[PDB]
Structure formats: structure tokens, C-alpha cells
Amino acid sequence: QNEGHECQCQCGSCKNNEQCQKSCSCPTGCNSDDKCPCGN
Ligand SMILES: [Cu+]
Ligand SMILES: [Cu+]
Ligand SMILES: [Cu+]
Ligand SMILES: [Cu+]
Ligand SMILES: [Cu+]
Ligand SMILES: [Cu+]
Ligand SMILES: [Cu+]
Prior knowledge:
By secondary structure, the chain is largely without helices or strands. Cu cation 7 binds at residues 24, 26, 38.
């Protein structure tokens, strides 16, 4: 029941990858390029 959420990630691998902007693996603290552990 819980898998994707909302990758509003503006990182460098989130802005170019729109295939994970609806199911990324980051919490609600992924709004800055850091240790963003997104999909890949
Ligand atoms: Cu994300
Ligand atoms: Cu990201
Ligand atoms: Cu993403
Ligand atoms: Cu992010
Ligand atoms: Cu992330
Ligand atoms: Cu993510
Ligand atoms: Cu992300």
C-alpha cells in the first residue's frame, strides 16, 4: 500500500529523471541536492 509518494526533488538526478518523480525513495526532506538516496 506504500511505495511511491512525491519526488519534488530538484536535485541533479531527480530533475532529469521524471520516471521517479512519482515513486522516488526519499522522505519529505529531499528538496535539496545532498545525500539524496532517490531511485538511482
Ligand atoms: Cu524524489
Ligand atoms: Cu533527488
Ligand atoms: Cu525522483
Ligand atoms: Cu532530492
Ligand atoms: Cu532523493
Ligand atoms: Cu527520491
Ligand atoms: Cu528524488
